[PDB]
Structures are given as structure tokens and as C-alpha cells.
RNA sequence: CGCUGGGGAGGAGGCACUCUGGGGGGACCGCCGGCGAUAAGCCGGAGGAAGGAGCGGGCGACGGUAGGUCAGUAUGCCCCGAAACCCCCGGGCUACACGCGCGCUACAAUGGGCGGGACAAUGGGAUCCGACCCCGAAAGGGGAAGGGAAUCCCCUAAACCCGCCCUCAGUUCGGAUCGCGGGCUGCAACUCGCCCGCGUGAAGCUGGAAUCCCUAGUACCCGCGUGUCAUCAUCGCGCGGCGAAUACGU
């Protein structure tokens, strides 16, 4: 069988389908244990080594990911492939040991960007040019 | 020259001229002169719970 | 085998440096005209200066003396198209500042806007001088 | 052969009349139809100053002109066409046909 | 040069980094217990939350506020060291990757020299420059003082952290030497009490000010 | 087994290292004295890096083929340096490009479509397979995790 | 292709996921405690996508300032009416011993260079955007599909990661200024335009008194769109990427 779950950070979108196999983990066609930079890496493969060898071992799992920068990505994914186990598994250890450790795995972020405002609408909101008279 | 400890157990207010010192009472432990209630003027942040180590024991900041 | 003073043409070279960057000394010569050099001649510009040989001083001599005979296309010289003889040329430390020195004399003679801007010591191309340009 | 028609407009309630009359005439007979199928709506934005000097603070107006857009398949048929191009339109909505 | 065993890491257990463990950490002082957490986690990484609850910070892993008071441009409007610095374009600022990695090779260098835990060697840096006593102005009757008033843990960790990394900033400004050998160098030194860190002088010229004006 | 199991660098340069047989791929007489768009300020430190940049060039038909000369300028292209004026993009040279992709063709390594770019053929296709084939064999040992792809 | 395990590109066919856009639900101090006085309300826990007018914007009262605009249009009084009316041709607003405001680039290693590897969003497009191919070292030149824009194009962004050179030095830091040459727009580039190559290589070694902006995806840092446009962005208005420290006061 086969299941289908999604991800969603600022402005980036991952999908990933799980279904039964050996440990492959694949992001944008390529495989996690050469992900660069370290940062990121560690972020995507967090889910994985907290469940443990002894249920991805057992499963293959493709992400395609779409959209802002790289760490959002990465979290996209992370997000997508805890909810994608959590689903296949069937099992409230994990859900919760997922909550404890960071809730943000199965729930999502809800931070986007304010808009602009016109005194130095390029910089920010809140930012404008000085006065030193 | 290691201070004594004491906790927090009450919240007087807030003091200075600015606002950012706070009066609190405090109980001493491990000192001379232990479960002995006192008030102090504290800087930073804080709750009942909190432990503050004390250089001294006889000051007794001045009530508002 | 090593040369802590290497004398090129009227310039002398630090050794412990590299030659593309030892060739920089000279007036007339940058960093890109000197790889340019060094690759036509056949000599590794990441070698330390003072490693260098009679024959290959001779040989980047000869190439500074006409570049353009030994290959160094005529759109990579400081003086394409001379203005009496054509026959694109590179100059060094003593005729280039008199290519200069003539040319603006020429502009002075014929008393053109750029010559009495040069003249007065003021900028020359396009500049607003208001605000900057203050000693 | 298949009739495809695009709707666009600044107020909703003619593009659903519109819609919902097309797709009565489509129901009554029995003829496949697809949609209303909803495109991406378009807006041309101005901003400007108001001051007309150029003493004061700065602020700006920020207009915005808005256009809807809704696509239909009709599969073509005779009484389809007879029975669709006979329809008012209401002049805040422009609609163009045409056979692929 | 890095090699690839390096390169291409791939942890195990749930440890910091992947590298070393805190099972085996203690604290000593009881005032700053409830505010030094070391809760098993492999990155330490808070993408901005905990900061508007007042006291969310306390559920912030220690490395983290580490590498984020270590993710600066210097000193700006003070002076630090004798002199302003200021970068402002060779500053890594918004930049947590390069902090990361700073951190990364400081531990890798205490390690080798002490062969403890470098977060063990960072909480008795962090315990041993933590000031106990400061000033304030106090107002009575309508004059002003300058009195002496006790501090808070939550704010002593601030004080050390901030003045570690400043301490790393001055050695590594226009040297030789770089930044991460800076830190290590100021946190051996701090965990040790030696004289030749800025961060047990500024303490002890705190405690000294407060004693003499309190 | 693929391109897509092996990071890009090892790859473009045991590539490069591989390129120098076929005789058909050489550099040209202007190669030894240019540099590599207008974004740039001095030239190529290295000797040997016209193979590298047909590698990658090829490598990059290989990923997104069909693709023409003007998306590979943007992705070899850069920021550039303008002196008190701020930095912009800029985007690189076509005769680097043109020249990498007629050697290719001529060792029958890509060939042209009717409209869009170019692509790898089969005796291509072998060639990355078997360099990352190499490659992966040599890797796997340092990071075992990859002998289950 | 490596080991028969894998991995790619099409077409049929689906709309499941993403996305788009119409309608509707959802949060109300509603539940449990303490404070306030038993009220009005305040501070905490719970579950929750979201808590305490959820977050960010638009609309800005009676009046008053002899605040700015008759050089955006309308308008009394006075004035020119052979002209101060309006149309061409050349100059100037770009002139520079100096005082000041707002900024850009820097004074280097929390880096410069070379070569490789990645990853966005907002908007715009008819003599307009222009893929694709061929010329040229570059700027650029010649043909030309498609697109009246969920169909094609502008568009594989930079900061970031990897390896090599440089190792504390007016330097492989920094770019001002100037010479020679090659180009595009335009009826016309001297006064007075923008781009490219080779040379040249000025101050600047963290800055006194004093002063400025900022409480969350906010500030710092990084680069793209559009308006002005025949050609010209260190500007305005907006878009995203990475992403903090402190205080919950007076």
C-alpha cells in the first residue's frame, strides 16, 4: 500500500508518500545521507532517528519539496515525514514522544511576513530613515 | 567569598527611578542566620520560587 | 637556485613571492597581463620568484619587448591603435608615462575642453564638483 | 467538437447569473459540462501621492481595480448554442466564445 | 580538508550535535539549576519561538543561547576593548550556520586540550563568571543615590554569555587568531579562574564596584 | 548507481580527470588568456579548467536537458563588484557554453532537439553512470549508509 | 547502471495531493482557580490552527492653525496685450576656495580571489516579452517558435556549502582619479548620457562632543520586481531568502 501526507512552512510546500521497503529516505531525488549543509541535514533525519531503526527499516519514503530557501524546505519535509510515519505506524508512543520533543513536527507554523509600510517601504515595517539635524 | 543562599517568597513592587528593580522578601538557608524573613531590593527578572544568593545578611532594604 | 632580487627589465622583484604577482611591481603590468604572459612564455605562475632562469627572463623580456608577435590578441594591450603608427603596442614604466604626457600636451596645444581641464587640475569626464571634490 | 467560453468581470453576482443561467440551459437537456472552472483574479494596482505640493510628510493612495475570471466547457451542441447565445448579458461582464 | 567521516556525518543516539552527552553534566550552584537546560537534543535550534512568553527562555537549550549571543557584530554604540566594532558587512548576522560552525570546532578544540565535556567546561565558565551583586539608582525624599542590589539568575546568565563571546570577539578582532579559537580560549580560561578572561575581570569589577558604593 | 546518488563535485571531477581521452574536446586558442563573464575580475588560476566547465556543462544537460544557451549563462553567471556603486547579478559568456556543447556533440555525447536545447544520448547516459557507479563503490565504505541505495 | 536490484523520459488516463476561488463553520474570558467588592474587569492553567479588541492594514469627528499649494485644474483684483501671448535654433538649471542633511563603498580573516554545488516570491509583457540556433573575448549583432498571458517569456537570484592560493601586511585589503580602444539608444552624445577590455592605483588602520531606528518572522544581513523610461537607479513603492538579543516596566 501506499500513503501521501503534506508539509508546510514559509512559503514552502513538501509532499511525501511512504509505502513498504528497506530505509530509503529520498529528497528531490536524492538521498538524505548527503544533504548539505549539516544544519539542514540534521533537521530532515531528527524524525527518523527518533523513531528508531526497527520502523525505517521497514519503509522508502520520497519527498518533493517546492519553494523557500532551503532551511523552510528542510522543515517542510521534516514536518511531512513525521506526520507520513505517524500515519503509517498507527501509534500513540511515537505521537507522543513527537509532541514531547517538538510539537511543531505534527503541528504546523503559522509565522508569515508582514507587509511593508512607505517611509523605507524596501527595508521593513518597522524601519525608517533617520533624523539627526 | 561565597554568599548565602535565600528564596523568594513574596512580591513587594516594582522601585527605582526607572522601574527596573524590584522589592521582594526573602527567607535565608544554609547561613547564620537561617529561615530568618528579610526584605531585599532585587535587579532582573523574577518569581516566587527563584533563589538569590546573598554576599550579606544585614541590610534590610528600606520599605517604599 | 633562488634569487631574493630578480632583475626584469629596469625593475627588481620580491622572490619569496609569486611571479604573477612579483610581475606586478612593474608599471605597466597587472595581474591578468601577467598570467597572459607567463602562459604564452610556458612558465608556472605559481611559482615562488628567484626560481627563475636567464633563459626565462629572456624569454618574458622578449615577449614584453612585442607581445602581440607571440600570440596576446591586440584587444588585451594598454595602447591598442597608437596614434601615429597604428601597430598596436604595450608600453612599461618609462615610455607609458611619456604616452601620457604626450597625449595630454596634445590636447593643451589644441586647446580642447578636456586639455583645460586638465590645466586647471579639475575633473575631466563627466563629474558634478558642488559637493565633492575638496582638495 | 467542443465550445469554450470565458467569462471575466468586476462584479460576481453578474458572472454567477451568468453561470447559473448556462448551466440550467446545459441541465435541461442532458449535455456534459465542466466548470465553472475559477482563474486566477487580476488586479491593477496604483499607487500615488496625495499631496499636490510637496511640502509635508509623504503619503500614498493605494487603488486597486479588480477583474474575476471564470472558464466553461459546453460540449457543443446545436441546441446548446441555440438556446446559450440567447442570453442578456449584463454589461459588467464580457464573455467570449469560441470551438476548440 | 576536511575529511568525509566529518563531512558527511550521520549521528546515532540523541546527543548534542550527535557528539557529546549531558547525562553525565551537573550544576552546582542552586540559583541557576531551574535556567540551564539540558534537555537531549541533536540540533539546537529554536526557529524564534519562546521569545514572546516572558519566561520562555528557560525552555532554550544552553547551546543554542550560546551560538545565538556568539551570532553578533561586536560592540556598536560602546566601547569594548578600547574600541568601537563595527563590521556591518563582514558580520555574521542572520547567519546561524557560521555560529554553528564556530561552536562546533571551539568544542572539538577543548576537548582535545582538557578531554573533558565541553559543555561541562562551559557551565563551570558560565558559574564562575556570574555576577552576584550590581548597582542602581535609588530614589528618597527627592535626591539621588547609587545603591547596591542583588541580581537575578536569569539575568546572570545573560551577563556571562554576552561577556564570553565579547571576550572572543576582542582576541579575534584584526589577528592572527581566529574566532573560534578565541572562544575556546576564553571559556578554558574562565572555567579555570585565571585573570586573562574578560569575563571573570568584568565580574569581579562589578562585585567590587557594588561592595565600595553599597 | 545513478547521478542523482553522488554529490556533484566528486563527480565533476572525476569527470574532468576522465574527459582528457576523447580526443574531439580540447581547448582553443583564446582559452589560455580570457576570463569567464564580465562578472568576474581575473582569470582562471587553474590550468586545466576548460575540462572542468564541459563536465559540468555536460552534468547539467544530463539534470535538466532540454536546455539551450541562455538558462546555463544565468546559472554560471554571478554578482559582480561595481566599484562605490552596489552589487548586482550578471549573468555570463555563450562562447564558453557554445564551444563545451559542439566538442560534446562532435564525441557524440549530446545531441540538439528542434526547439529546445539539448540532450544526453545513451552512450552519454553510460558514461555518468558508470564514473558514479566508481565513485559510489569508492564512497560507501566511508559512509555505509549508502549501500542500501 | 552494480550485483536484478534500482533510477529516469514520454503517451494514455486520473484530480487523489498541491494550487486556484465562491459559499460556510471556528474564539466567546466560553471552562477551572486567585485577585478586584459579591460587579465592571485583571493574572494564570486546559484543550486548541489560532487566545485574550487573533495578526496587519483602510475609513480619521466639532474646530483651529492668516501651516503648504494661484508652477496640477477652477477662480476674483491688478498687470502684458505688439506683448510678459506661442513656435523654432543654439546655451543653462550638470558652473565650485567652502558650511550642512540623507545615503553608497570601505578601512579586511565574523575575509579577498579562482573553480565547482544548491535554493525564491511579488509583478509586467504588441512593432512589447522574446525561448531556440548561429556569429563575437566581452559589451553586443543576425534570424526566429510561442504568447493579447494559470498555456510563452522576463526567471537555474544573492547571501550559503566544498576544495585550492593568500596569513595580519597601505597587503592578492580599498577603489577614487586618469590614458588608449570597442559598443547600444536617439534627428542630435563637446558642453552633458550608459556598457565592455587592457593599464593607473588617491584618501582610508573602527572614528571627540553629540545624536538616530527598532518588542516577532520584528530588527540586522542578502539580493529581485515595478514607477519614472527611446537611452539612464547609490531613489520611491513593494516582494521574498536567512533570522536574533532584552523588557512584559517607569
Redesign the interface.
Given at each position: 500500500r501506499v500513503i501521501q501526507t503534506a508539509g508546510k512552512r514559509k512559503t514552502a510546500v513538501a509532499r511525501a508518500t511512504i509505502r513498504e521497503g528497506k530505509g530509503r529516505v529520498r529528497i528531490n531525488h536524492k538521498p538524505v545521507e548527503i544533504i548539505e549543509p549539516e544544519i539542514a541535514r540534521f533537521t530532515i533525519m531528527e524524525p527518523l532517528i527518533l523513531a528508531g531503526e526497527e520502523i525505517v527499516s521497514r519503509v522508502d519514503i520520497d519527498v518533493k519539496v517546492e519553494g523557500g530557501g532551503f532551511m523552510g524546505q528542510a522543515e517542510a519535509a521534516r514536518v511531512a515525514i513525521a506526520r507520513a510515519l505517524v500515519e503509517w505506524t498507527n501509534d500513540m508512543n511515537l505521537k507522543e514522544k513527537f509532541m514531547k520533543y517538538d510539537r511543531t513536527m505534527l503541528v504546523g507554523d503559522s509565522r508569515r511576513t508582514e507587509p511593508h509600510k512607505?517611509n523605507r517601504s524596501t527595508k521593513g515595517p518597522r524601519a525608517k530613515r533617520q533624523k539627526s539635524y | 567569598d561565597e554568599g548565602y543562599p535565600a528564596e523568594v517568597i513574596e512580591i513587594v513592587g516594582r522601585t527605582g527611578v526607572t522601574g527596573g528593580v524590584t522589592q521582594v522578601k526573602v527567607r535565608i538557608l544554609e547561613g547564620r542566620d537561617k529561615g530568618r524573613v528579610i526584605r531585599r531590593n532585587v535587579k532582573g527578572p523574577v518569581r516566587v520560587g527563584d533563589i538569590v544568593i546573598l554576599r550579606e545578611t544585614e541590610r534590610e532594604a528600606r520599605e517604599i | 637556485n633562488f634569487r631574493h632580487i630578480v632583475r626584469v627589465a629596469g625593475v627588481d622583484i620580491d622572490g619569496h613571492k609569486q611571479v604573477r604577482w612579483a610581475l606586478t611591481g612593474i608599471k605597466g603590468i597587472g595581474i591578468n597581463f601577467a598570467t597572459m604572459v607567463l602562459r604564452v612564455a610556458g612558465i608556472d605562475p605559481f611559482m615562488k620568484a628567484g626560481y627563475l632562469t636567464d633563459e626565462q627572463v629572456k624569454k618574458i623580456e622578449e615577449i614584453l619587448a612585442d607581445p602581440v608577435a607571440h600570440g596576446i590578441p591586440a584587444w588585451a594591450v594598454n595602447r591598442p591603435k597608437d596614434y601615429e603608427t597604428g601597430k598596436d603596442m604595450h608600453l612599461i614604466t618609462a615610455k607609458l608615462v611619456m604616452a601620457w604626457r604626450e597625449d595630454v600636451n596634445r590636447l593643451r596645444r589644441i586647446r580642447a575642453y578636456r586639455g583645460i581641464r586638465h590645466e586647471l587640475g579639475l575633473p575631466v569626464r563627466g563629474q558634478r564638483t558642488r559637493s565633492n571634490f575638496r582638495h | 467538437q467542443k465550445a469554450r467560453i470565458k467569462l471575466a468581470s468586476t462584479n460576481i453576482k453578474a458572472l454567477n447569473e451568468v453561470t447559473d443561467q448556462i448551466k440550467q440551459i446545459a441541465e435541461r437537456t442532458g449535455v456534459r459540462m465542466s466548470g465553472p472552472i475559477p482563474l486566477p483574479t487580476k488586479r491593477i494596482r496604483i499607487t500615488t501621492r496625495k499631496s499636490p505640493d510637496g511640502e509635508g510628510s509623504?503619503?500614498?493612495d493605494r487603488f486597486e481595480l479588480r477583474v474575476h475570471k471564470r472558464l466553461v466547457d459546453i460540449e457543443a451542441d446545436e441546441r446548446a448554442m441555440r438556446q446559450i447565445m440567447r442570453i442578456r448579458v449584463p454589461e459588467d461582464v464580457t464573455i467570449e466564445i469560441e470551438l476548440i | 580538508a576536511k575529511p568525509l567521516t566529518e563531512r558527511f556525518f550521520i549521528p546515532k543516539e540523541v546527543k548534542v550535535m550527535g557528539r557529546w552527552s549531558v547525562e553525565d553534566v551537573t550544576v552546582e550552584d542552586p540559583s541557576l539549576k531551574p535556567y540551564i537546560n539540558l534537555d537531549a537534543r541533536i540540533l539546537p535550534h529554536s526557529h524564534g519561538r519562546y521569545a514572546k512568553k516572558p519566561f520562555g527562555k528557560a525552555n532554550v537549550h544552553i547551546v543554542e543561547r550560546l551560538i545565538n549571543k556568539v551570532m553578533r557584530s561586536g560592540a556598536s554604540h560602546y566601547k569594548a576593548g578600547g574600541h568601537f566594532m563595527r563590521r556591518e558587512h563582514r558580520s555574521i548576522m542572520s547567519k546561524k550556520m557560521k555560529a554553528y560552525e564556530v561552536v562546533k570546532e571551539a568544542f572539538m578544540i577543548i576537548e582535545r586540550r582538557t578531554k573533558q565535556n565541553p559543555i561541562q567546561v562551559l557551565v563551570k565558565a558560565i558559574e564562575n563568571s556570574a555576577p552576584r551583586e550590581d548597582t542602581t539608582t535609588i530614589a528618597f525624599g527627592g535626591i539621588r543615590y547609587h545603591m547596591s542590589v542583588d541580581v537575578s539568575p536569569l539575568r546572570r546568565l545573560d551577563i556571562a554569555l554576552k561577556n564570553i563571546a565579547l571576550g572572543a570577539s576582542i582576541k579575534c578582532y584584526r589577528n592572527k587568531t581566529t574566532y573560534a579559537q578565541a572562544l575556546a580560549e576564553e571559556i578554558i580560561a574562565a572555567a579555570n579562574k585565571d585573570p586573562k578572561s574578560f569575563a571573570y575581570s568584568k565580574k569581579e569589577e562589578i562585585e567590587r564596584i557594588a561592595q565600595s558604593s553599597r | 548507481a545513478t547521478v542523482y546518488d553522488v554529490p556533484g563535485d566528486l563527480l565533476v571531477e572525476r569527470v574532468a580527470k576522465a574527459l582528457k581521452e576523447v580526443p574531439e574536446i580540447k581547448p582553443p586558442e583564446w582559452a589560455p588568456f580570457v576570463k569567464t563573464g564580465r562578472h568576474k575580475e581575473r582569470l582562471p588560476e587553474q590550468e586545466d579548467w576548460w575540462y572542468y566547465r564541459v563536465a559540468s556543462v555536460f552534468r547539467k544537460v544530463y539534470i535538466d536537458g532540454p536546455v539551450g544557451i541562455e538558462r546555463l549563462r544565468t546559472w554560471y553567471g554571478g554578482r559582480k563588484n561595481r566599484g562605490h556603486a552596489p552589487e548586482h547579478f550578471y549573468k555570463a559568456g555563450g562562447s564558453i557554453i557554445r564551444k563545451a556543447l559542439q566538442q560534446l556533440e562532435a564525441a557524440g555525447f549530446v545531441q540538439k532537439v528542434p526547439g529546445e536545447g539539448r540532450i544526453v544520448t545513451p552512450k552519454g547516459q553510460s558514461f555518468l553512470d558508470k564514473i558514479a557507479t566508481e565513485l559510489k563503490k569508492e564512497l560507501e565504505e566511508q559512509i555505509p549508509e549508502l549501500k542500501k541505495y
Open positions: 512607505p | - | - | 509623504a503619503t500614498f | - | -
